[PDB]
RNA sequence: CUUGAGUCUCGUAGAGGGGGGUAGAAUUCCAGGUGUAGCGGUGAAAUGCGUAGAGAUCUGGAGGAAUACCGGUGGCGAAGGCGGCCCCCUGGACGAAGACUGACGCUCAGGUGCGAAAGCGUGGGGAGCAAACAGGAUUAGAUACCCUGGUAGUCCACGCCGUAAACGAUGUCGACUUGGAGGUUGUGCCGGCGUGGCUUCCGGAGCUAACGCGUUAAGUCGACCGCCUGGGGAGUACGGCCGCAAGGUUAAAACUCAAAUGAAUUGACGGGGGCCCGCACAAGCGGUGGAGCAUGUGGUUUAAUUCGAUGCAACGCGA
């Protein structure tokens, strides 16, 4: 309920899907979507256009507060990485802010194993 | 699989007839969708030779092979139908 | 089946394929510069979008 | 095919209303080259569809056409072991042709007398957004709504 | 890769800033990379594969000029 | 005696070794706040995790392991190997002028020492990863590949093992024999011209079965050592020695084959690549496969059912 005018959008893109998140500027989570959510599963889940809706309806789910402002916080390779930053342009917010936070060891642990296949 | 038997200069008594039979029963392992099959056997001077096509779902696999016998030749043919067999399998089943 | 299809068209696509494919430029078959131009041209292209595919 | 056919192929119009459009209509429903036993049921048709719209012939058969034409179809593409449905726009003089053809797959599976009701029956519906050949495009339309995802491949 | 808007800049001109901001960062291919491990062999392999490649990229700027085509 | 070898003096560059500190990124966990229905994963799925509130997001704490960028056909080491930053101990190389010793050298069977990874012993430690193992898939089957978990192990101390495609598949030392383009590190004299070390690519004569090598030789020579003598059987058996074990090392024979091998050549083939075509797919129209009948063939039958044609390219075919 209470309105806020000024939030932050963290987009959590993976290879297999998308998580959006509102929050407030101090990380309290206010709405969220996903692709898996949104209504596709698999092949489409994995899509720019399956990341689109998410942002988009996670746009309202956040209507109730206020809105105004928006830094979005853009995190890893998946093809979510953009079409979402699109839609929440065009789902009426003014973007001041914009970064990658993609996580990055300087070395840090051994990853797994290559696929054969 | 509808098997069907020729013989091109030979007899086809109710061993060679059985024996082929059983043979070729085994093929199916290796390719379930399997479809009408002809079978011919020669004998020319000194060669006994054994060929079959193979009606398959959206192919045709044919292979011939020379024995001393006429078994000795159908056994050698076997082995081949087999590896074809395998090899288009497995480029349908390509994920 | 009468008449060659458009060469700087088909140029341009077997550029794009490569492209997407990932084959690295210097693979272009063209040194007539002006299908060299539209090879190229697509496999720029299609650099981009591969990057927003899995 | 893999070069480019060169030369269309003249379709004359309608003798009675003098359309290249109707013209094409006759012939999708003409059967083993029997053009004239085509051309009457075509206008016996109209004839009904005239009798009853009372808004002419070569505008009210239009208006069939518009309610059936898609405008988003669906091309099939074959990846990994799966395959992909994938939207594309139709051509005008594409859609124009499913139209036509739509229709009359629709009108001959029917259980009326003649042809000539059958069709007149199917172009009539159609106006009103009713029969099978208006559930067709509905589907068509359905299924690339669907699968929209795949709008932008190239592949 | 951090873009902060400018008055009255358009969306459509940040977004392009903010893209060519991590292509010169180049995070993507950090993270591509990162995906699995490489064994240490594999790693130095590869090393000497660009180098034996960027060295013939050396060759054509020189070699093809004096050549010539019909 | 001073040219080989070495000693001293002044400097240079360096992931060379040993010990001890410490810093940032990240992952996993633990404890809170926000928040709500999915997360995760795949070619496609499922097992798994989640309304007992996950995933996502913010704050605090714990702990281990590895050191992004710099970073390079860069550098150091006898080889194996060596990568954050800082101090403590310590080895080698290289150059500039000088001085000093006076053949003190090179090689080396036996011997001695060092020696990746895995593995073993005792005691620690354990984030991530991951043999074994368990579950989910795929497949005709799948004790695999792929997915979800996961124990030894990977890390530290001390002690063993003594092996690797431990490779430049090229023993060490010295001399001599056209060139070109680089990289790295010294030093002369004027940002040009010289003179040292190490190193990368290319090529001449020569050499080589050819591929190729080519002043860092596989060229031309000298000194010493190691090793080979057809293929399987076999780096195996027996014996000795070494090891806690796993095993290592030294190392045969009977029997059997007429070959086994190296490099290059023409083709053919690839679930290799590029480029162009084709009712090849795609876009479409009408059929065959079901019925009745005609017709040919196989089978059976027959006294005889005349003979031939048999994948595509025999089966309304010779007729
Ligand atoms: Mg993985
Ligand atoms: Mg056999
Ligand atoms: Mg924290
Ligand atoms: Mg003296
Ligand atoms: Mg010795
Ligand atoms: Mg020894
Ligand atoms: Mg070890
Ligand atoms: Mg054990
Ligand atoms: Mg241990
Ligand atoms: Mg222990
Ligand atoms: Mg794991
Ligand atoms: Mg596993
Ligand atoms: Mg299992
Ligand atoms: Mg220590
Ligand atoms: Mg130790
Ligand atoms: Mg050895
Ligand atoms: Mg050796
Ligand atoms: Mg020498
Ligand atoms: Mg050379
Ligand atoms: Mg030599
Ligand atoms: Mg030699
Ligand atoms: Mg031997
Ligand atoms: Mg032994
Ligand atoms: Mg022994
Ligand atoms: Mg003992
Ligand atoms: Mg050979
Ligand atoms: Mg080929
Ligand atoms: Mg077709
Ligand atoms: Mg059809
Ligand atoms: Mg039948
Ligand atoms: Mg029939
Ligand atoms: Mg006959
Ligand atoms: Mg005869």
Redesign the pocket.
Same mark, same amino acid.
């Given at each position: 309920r209470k309105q806020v005018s000024d939030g932050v959008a963290?987009i959590?893109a993976?290879? %297999?899907?998308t $998580? #959006?998140?509102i929050?407030?500027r101090? !990380?309290?989570? @206010?709405?969220?979507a996903?692709?898996? !959510?949104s209504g596709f599963?698999?092949?489409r889940?994995?899509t720019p256009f399956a990341a689109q809706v998410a942002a988009e309806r996670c746009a309202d789910a956040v209507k109730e507060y206020g809105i105004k402002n928006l830094e979005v916080?853009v995190?890893g390779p998946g093809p979510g990485r953009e079409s979402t930053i699109r839609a929440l342009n065009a789902a009426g917010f003014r973007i001041t802010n914009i970064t990658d936070?993609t996580? $990055?060891?300087?070395x !840090?642990?051994?990853?797994? =194993? =290559?696929?054969? #296949? | 699989m509808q098997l069907? /038997?020729?013989? %091109?200069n030979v007899e $086809?008594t109710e061993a060679l007839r059985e024996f082929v039979t059983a043979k070729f029963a085994k093929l199916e392992?290796?390719?379930?969708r399997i479809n009408q099959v002809?079978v011919?056997l020669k004998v020319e001077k000194v060669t006994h030779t054994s060929?079959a096509?193979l009606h398959v779902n959206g192919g045709?696999i044919?292979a011939?092979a020379e024995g001393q016998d006429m078994y000795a030749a159908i056994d050698g043919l076997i082995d081949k139908l087999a590896?074809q067999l395998? +090899?288009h +399998?497995?480029?349908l089943?390509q994920? | 089946?009468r008449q =060659?299809?458009d060469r700087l068209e088909? &140029?341009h696509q077997?550029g794009y394929? *490569?492209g997407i *494919?990932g084959?690295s430029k210097e693979?272009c078959?063209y040194q007539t510069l002006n299908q060299r131009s539209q090879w190229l041209g697509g496999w720029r292209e299609a650099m981009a979008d591969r990057v927003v595919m899995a | 095919?893999?070069?480019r056919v060169i030369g269309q192929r003249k379709i004359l119009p309608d003798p009675k209303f003098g359309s290249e459009l109707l013209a094409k209509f006759v012939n /999708?429903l003409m059967?083993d080259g029997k053009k004239s036993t085509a051309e009457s049921i075509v206008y016996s048709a109209l004839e009904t569809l005239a009798q009853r719209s009372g808004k002419s012939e070569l505008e009210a058969f239009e208006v069939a056409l518009e309610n059936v034409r898609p405008t988003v179809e669906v +091309?099939?593409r074959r #990846?990994? !072991?799966?395959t992909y449905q994938v939207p594309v726009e139709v051509r005008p003089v594409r859609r124009n042709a @499913?139209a036509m053809?739509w229709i009359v797959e629709a009108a001959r599976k029917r259980g009326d007398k003649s042809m000539a009701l059958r069709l007149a029956n199917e172009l009539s519906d159609a106006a009103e957004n009713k029969g099978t050949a208006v559930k067709k495009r509905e589907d068509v339309h359905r299924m690339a709504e669907a699968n929209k995802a795949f709008a932008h491949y190239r592949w | 890769p951090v873009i902060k808007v400018r008055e009255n800049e358009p969306f459509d001109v940040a977004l392009r800033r903010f893209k060519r901001s991590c292509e010169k960062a180049g995070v993507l291919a950090?993270v591509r990379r990162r995906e699995f491990?490489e064994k240490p062999t594999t790693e130095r392999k590869r &090393?000497?594969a660009? *180098?034996?490649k960027?060295?013939a990229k050396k060759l054509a700027r020189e070699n093809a000029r004096r050549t010539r085509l019909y």
């Open positions: 963290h959590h993976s290879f %297999n899907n $998580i #959006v998140t929050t407030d101090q !990380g309290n989570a @206010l709405g969220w996903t692709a898996g !959510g599963r698999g092949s889940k994995s916080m995190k936070v996580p $990055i060891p300087h !840090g642990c051994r990853p797994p =194993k =290559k696929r054969r #296949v | 069907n /038997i020729t013989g %091109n $086809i392992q290796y390719f379930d002809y011919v060929d096509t045709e044919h011939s590896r395998t +090899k +399998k497995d480029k089943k994920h | 089946k =060659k299809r088909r &140029a077997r394929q *490569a *494919a084959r693979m078959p | 095919p893999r070069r /999708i059967v +091309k099939s #990846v990994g !072991g799966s @499913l053809r | 950090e491990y &090393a000497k660009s *180098a034996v960027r060295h």
